Symmetry: D2
Subunit: 253 residues, 4 copies
């Protein structure tokens, strides 16, 4: 168990599959108690049961205060909650559709609610719990990793809602780091490119791969988890957005 993680626990939103699952497995392997915070109950309990004692599934709706507070209470029974990775994941619509109609507002607000409001709701509640922990000798109480997307910098046709939500998370990063600096809680963000998430898991894989300089493939969940673990453990990285994208820059289509 790595020194920073001694006595500690973590929450991973979207922890039952994909990028979140890989993050859970990495943090668990590195010695943290981990709460799998997700709505996918069969997958989440299977993962928690596989990993054993230091992994617990909690059915968690990221936009509900009471649901996230229950995840926090669960994490504080595995150790002192000091870390969180907000990795919850998940159709395109142009702002003016091909028939001339505007984008449906409901679709926009649902995307903002899940990816931006959900990220803030998890961050504020987890941060308030971490703020109450004893600092380590270096002054740090803990750290958060948020998940954006390079769509927040280079949003694509039909993806204005996702681009706006993920840009919101990108801009949140430095503001939250500044806010939480008095508590010694670092905040950083991973902006992935095109990742091999469950929906992606070999013909149409070449179409994405084609715009990706190197490696010429989708990024793996384990690569994401490695990035998240680095942001939790490096003591000077703060208020930063890390692009994790094989040097891809999104084209319009």
């Amino acid at each position: 168990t790595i020194k920073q993680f001694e006595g500690a626990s973590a929450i991973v939103s979207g922890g039952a599959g994909g990028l979140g699952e890989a993050t859970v497995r990495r943090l668990h392997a590195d010695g943290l108690g981990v709460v799998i915070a997700d709505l996918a109950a069969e997958k989440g309990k299977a993962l928690a049961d596989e990993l054993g004692n230091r992994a617990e599934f909690v059915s968690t709706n990221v936009t509900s205060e009471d649901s996230v507070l229950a995840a926090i209470e669960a994490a504080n029974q595995l150790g002192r909650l000091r870390y969180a990775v907000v990795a919850h994941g998940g159709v395109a619509q142009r702002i003016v559709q091909r028939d001339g109609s505007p984008a449906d507002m409901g679709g926009f607000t649902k995307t903002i609610d899940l990816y931006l409001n959900g990220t803030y709701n998890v961050a504020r509640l987890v941060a308030a719990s971490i703020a109450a922990a004893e600092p380590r000798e270096n002054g740090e109480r803990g750290a958060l990793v948020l998940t954006a997307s390079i769509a927040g910098y280079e949003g694509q046709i039909g993806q204005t809602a996702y681009a706006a939500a993920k840009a919101g998370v990108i801009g949140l990063t430095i503001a939250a780091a500044r806010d939480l600096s008095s508590a010694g809680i670092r905040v950083n963000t991973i902006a992935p490119g095109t990742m091999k998430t469950p929906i992606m898991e070999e013909e149409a894989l070449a179409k994405f791969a084609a715009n990706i300089p190197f490696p010429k493939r989708l990024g793996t969940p384990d690569e994401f988890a490695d990035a998240a673990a680095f942001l939790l453990t490096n003591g000077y990285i703060n208020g930063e957005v890390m692009r994790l994208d094989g040097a891809q820059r999104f084209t319009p289509k």
Copy 2:
């Protein structure tokens, strides 16, 4: 009247005061019919009356489809709607993520800020873009142009202002995505990210705090004027090649944490 604006109309959200008022005055002087889209009824009506028959006040809640659709119908009586400047202003909720007593920031305060500055911007943009997309293009292929308003808080958010920072960062990121979306319609989309600007709401902080703000600003060593904002907005509407861009308008200021 400049060729771009002949026969055309524009909607300015937040048009009744501050940055929006200056934009209305500028676009009206440049030959556009203008709809002052605002909830400030007395100020808005007064401005519309002062400017005359090519300026109309429409009471507009930017988060309401019905209300924005009414502003669009009014604009289309003043010419063909080709332009909008989304300039509704004010502050976000002032609260730290973790507050002094250890409690978290109020989620309501955050979502209200996102609703007004991000969702409100998207709602105005989607409805106005749909109208403009139905217009005939000019010889150069362009049907119209939108200017959204962000803030440099979107890049350099401050302590206690995570809600505003998130909302304005959302607008910043929306810019290139919307420009890409609307490119098949020939509608340009750009955004102004103001620094600290001289508006009534800003000046409510009192002279001592304003003096502090002016000190962080390299040159000019003062708050930006509404007329400077209006001039940038007009430029984004008229220059034919600027698209998907965010323009910082800030006297070279970079926000410090506090």
Copy 3:
């Protein structure tokens, strides 16, 4: 003549043709005395001759102090030098970091590109800024303003064009630093980062270029560049900013 420009003069590097020429024409029409600072002598002189006695051509190598100083002297005979647009164009060396045959990029090619686009920009800026700093400020406190030219290659550099990407990114980063440095003199500094523009080389497969350009689906015009440069010179609050002028293009690798 707009009041910002009354009694004032300007230098445009690369002014003989392309983006620079459109800029010279615009600034001259707006009432400034203009020096065309360029090495293309016949083209530059013909432009100065066409525009008349408020336009002068000075053969200028942007990396030579004495050469730029002579352009400044000429400018100060046409009015008080308050503005410059650094618009000297062309491409960098076209070469991969590691070439087809396994050999590294030629260092001379890289350094030539850096010298022309980055060192050349700084040399013009420092000398023009020194001159402008000695001018009397206007009532608003402003002595003058500079516009630098970068490229979106500085953000999204391309295969075979690392030299140009590095030089132009240097210009991008210089912008805020120079604005802060010159803030005490009341000299604003901003930069235009063009996308794919219809420069003289493009006068002679345009659709291949325009295919990655969202809207307008064409190359940017010199007049659109000049309009952006005029705005950066006249708007009183824009400072330390880089303006992308690219029809929403984002450069692909190739």
Copy 4:
């Protein structure tokens, strides 16, 4: 020995001291053969001797092709050269673009800074990349990786430091271009942009002056350590999907004008 580092070697420019030294020690600890490429011969030799037979000192001027080629030959006696961290630097004198007496900054000061930080970086990169491009790829297609060092000054350059800002911005912009250029060879290219770091230059800095830096750094409220830089470099060399990226390593600091 880290799996990616099996049988491999690395060059670290500026490897004799400060950020480079910590990087040498971390890479060596992780199982790489390391070449300390630096002009500081006495420090460099002492470090190579302390670390043992998997560390070698080579006196290297980063702007000399033959000098850098000698470092690459040395690296290839220690393993297959697959990695480099370009962490060299130098002493700088502040100079404003227009000085107090009205004179312009000395061009020589600007070109020397560009030569060391930008040209020097490119010279090391092209020669190291050429050698790495000849190595057999791993099964994942990767031949190796480079880490360049910039500075947050390349985003937020400071008064009197225009030359350093321009040079470091050049390195920043080079990152994505070099990653694209080298993608067909399977050589990743990333960059660290440090904030204010505890390097030998800071050893004698006063308690008041340390407080001044700390007051602008949100958290941790102190200078970054060389080991923290080294840890970032090791991550960029090992993570298989990070490419063409600039990593700010700065305690959330944003540089103010002064």
